[PDB]
């Protein structure tokens, strides 16, 4: 209706709108890991418990086995090494 009887000239800028934002403590380092494999370890010990019925093969499993699980808990210390938290218009509706 600014075009119905009158006119604009052509574009100086383009369409937008702005959003003004002004600017769990120890739980958060287990969160980079999939929580299912905790119980995948927890069911593995019943499998090892079958072996009641050598033993050094079963020990030698485990000295290789939880090796990496210790390294896996050593892994997620690097959580920043590679106010607002979420940036979607829809994500901030909630």
């Amino acid at each position: 209706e600014r075009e119905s009887v009158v006119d604009f000239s052509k574009r100086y800028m383009d369409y937008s709108v702005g959003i003004l934002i002004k600017k769990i403590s120890i739980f958060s380092l287990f969160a980079p890991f999939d929580f299912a494999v905790w119980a995948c370890i927890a069911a593995a010990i019943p499998v090892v418990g079958v072996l009641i019925f050598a033993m050094r093969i079963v020990m030698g499993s485990w000295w290789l086995f939880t090796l990496i699980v210790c390294s896996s808990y050593t892994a997620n210390l690097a959580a920043f090494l590679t106010p607002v938290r979420t940036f979607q218009d829809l994500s901030k509706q909630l």
Partner: protein, 117 residues
């Protein structure tokens, strides 16, 4: 102007020109705000004129070409450059401490239950 401090004092994300918020970031003595981008270039902003004017396409030709040279964006970068003024634990005791106190209370329960048995 109300949306300055009401967004400062009260969880209000606002609906406004980004460039005003850009200069409000350019003015605050502490880098203490947050903005999120927007990109809608199918709709534009032109400049009104008298309905019937001889040089309208000639006006818009400079509107065109100063953007084609990009010096229009240098005019944007005059009053608001790209950097601006704003460039945009030891209390974790109880948490793991409490999960086993279920068991720590349940030990004496099964003790006194079977010791009476």
């Amino acid at each position: 102007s109300e949306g300055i401090r009401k967004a400062k004092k009260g969880n209000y994300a606002f609906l406004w020109d980004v460039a005003v918020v850009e200069y409000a970031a350019l003015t605050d003595d502490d880098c203490s705000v947050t903005v999120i981008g927007n990109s809608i270039s199918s709709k534009g902003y032109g400049i009104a004129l008298q309905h019937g004017s001889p040089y309208r396409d000639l006006f818009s030709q400079r509107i065109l070409e100063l953007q084609d040279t990009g010096d229009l964006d240098v005019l944007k970068q005059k009053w608001w450059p790209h950097t601006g003024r704003c460039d945009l634990s030891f209390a974790g005791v109880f948490c793991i401490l409490a999960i086993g106190l279920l068991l720590a209370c349940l030990v004496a329960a099964l003790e006194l239950w079977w010791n009476s048995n």
